[PDB]
Each structure stands twice: as structure tokens, then as C-alpha cells.
Amino acid sequence: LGGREAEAHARPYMASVQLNGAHLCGGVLVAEQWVLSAAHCLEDAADGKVQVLLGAHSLSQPEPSKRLYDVLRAVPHPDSQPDTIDHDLLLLQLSEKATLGPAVRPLPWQRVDRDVAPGTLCDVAGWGIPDSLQHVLLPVLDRATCNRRTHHDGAITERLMCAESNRRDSCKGDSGGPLVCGGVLEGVVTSGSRVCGNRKKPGIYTRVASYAAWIDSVLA
């Protein structure tokens, strides 16, 4: 473990989904040629060019591991739609297998369909408003509380999970950012609301383990 040039990055699985050269959404490298993000990211596809940037820590600094990849195909869950929070997953296939290294490496995702224990501190990372990749450990909430914190609209299914969150988070945070617990991908954020108000809201993430068969079916 020594390459005088290429530097190691703490979160080598983070991918930046870009549109016309600017950060659109965070994503996670889950296989050499696949990046998982949220379907709502490709919402207002300005019809521009969409690419995936890997090996980046900071989007405003030169780094030897940064590499741009084009997208061969974008596969949103078949049941996702703009007016629902459900099945908000999106798999992007890169133009070619990503060259892996100290700054580029796939992250294992949870295939065992069981809830993350409430209270567990999970790593949420992404590029907010962007510069250096931002990350915070947020505690997972029990579904009961989350349901009541969402004003009880039964919006939280067993295919979704919740984490604590502050205001900036719910308005200035990465719109496709993963939720990683114990080094395993567990969730993908469902929010993208850019309107910053005083309305505090918990963080809602799509549980990847809940869509294991689908992810498997797509990557096969």
C-alpha cells in the first residue's frame, strides 16, 4: 500500500452524478460498472449530458483519481414515478468498467432484508451546496417515531427507513446520497426539496435490501 501519487479517499465508493458538468446527485458505486442513486435525480433531465464522476473527494480541487464516465443506460425502478416516494431507486451503467483503486471502490449493499437497529449511527455522505465530500453520522429512528414525526401520513412503509436530520440537511443536502451502516449500504435518500424553510423533517431513505431481487436482476 504505497503509490507516491494517487491518494486514498475515505469514501472511495462515492460517485457524483453530473448534468452538463455540475453536481446533480450523489450516488454509490455498487459494482464495477454500476452506480446506485435515486430515481428523482433524473427528474428534470435538462436533456443535457449526464455523466458519473468517480474517485473524487473534493469537486473543487485537482485529484489524480478523478475520472469521468459516460452513462450507457439509466435504469429507474419500474414502479417509481415523480409523485410518489416509493421505489425511488436508479441504477446507472457506466460506459465501461471503472478502474478501481485507492480512491475508487464498490461498496457492498445489504441483501438481508432486516431493519437497521434504531439508534445505530449511520454514515450519510454527499456534496452539499460544492467542495469536499461532506459526511455525518446520523442515528436511525424506529419506524413508529418516524411515522409520528411525518405527521402520521403512513408514508413510511417497510421498504423505507428514517434517520435524524437538521434543517440544512433537508434543504441543502445531497439529493441522492447513500446511508451506510457498518460499512454496508442500507439506504438512499428520497429527498430533493430545495426550498429551505423552518419546517423540520426527518430523513427518509429507501432501504436497498428491500429491492435486492431487482438490483440483482439489473446487474446480472
Domain ranges in the chain are: 1-11+107-209, 12-106+210-219
Q: Do you know the residue count of the chain?
A: 220
The three three-digit cell numbers of residue 111, written as one number? 441483501
- Rounded to whole angstroms, the Cα distance separating 157 from 104 reads 33
Question: Which residue is listed with cell 507516491?
Answer: 4
What is the dihedral sign for C-alpha 199, 202, 205, 207? Answer: negative
The three three-digit cell numbers of residue 197, written as one number? 424553510
Which residue among the candidates 9, 77, 88, 123 is catalytic per the annotation?
Answer: 88
CB 181 within 8 A of CB 120: yes
In the CATH scheme, what is the homologous superfamily, with its name and number, of domain 1-11+107-209?
A: Trypsin-like serine proteases (2.40.10.10)
Alpha-carbon separation of residue 50 from 20, 23, 105 (angstroms) = 6, 10, 21
Q: How many CA atoms lie within 13 A of 31 on its CB side?
A: 13
CB 66 within 8 A of CB 57: no
The three three-digit cell numbers of residue 130, written as one number? 460544492
Q: Which technique?
A: X-ray
The three three-digit cell numbers of residue 38, written as one number? 435515486
Which residue among the candidates 80, 165, 170, 175 is catalytic per the annotation?
Answer: 175
Nearest by Cα to 158 from 210, 195, 193:
210
Residue 136, phi then psi, degrees to nearest 5: -145, 150
Q: Please list the alpha-helical segments (H only) found in the chain.
A: 143-149, 169-172, 212-219
Cα Dmax for the chain: 54
CB 103 within 8 A of CB 8: yes
Residues 6+ apart with CB under 8 A from 70: 51, 94, 95
Count Cβ neighbours within 10 Å for each residue of 183-217 and write b for 16 or more, e otherwise. ebbbbbbbbbeeeeeeeebbbbbbbbbbbeebbee
Residues 6+ apart with CB under 8 A from 213: none
80 is known as an active-site residue: no
- Rounded to whole angstroms, the Cα distance separating 152 from 149 reads 7
9 is known as an active-site residue: no
23 is known as an active-site residue: no
CB count in 10 Å sphere of residue 7: 13
Which residue among the candidates 40, 57, 77, 87 is catalytic per the annotation?
Answer: 40
Asked whether this chain's domains 1-11+107-209 and 12-106+210-219 adopt the same fold, the reply is yes
The highest-level CATH class for domain 12-106+210-219 is mainly beta
Tell me what percent of the chain is helix, strand and coil, each rounded to the nearest 5. Answer: 10, 35, 50
CB 68 within 8 A of CB 49: no
- Rounded to whole angstroms, the Cα distance separating 47 from 206 reads 26
- DSSP readout, 143-182? HHHHHHHTTS-S---TTEEEE---TTHHHHS-SS-EEEET
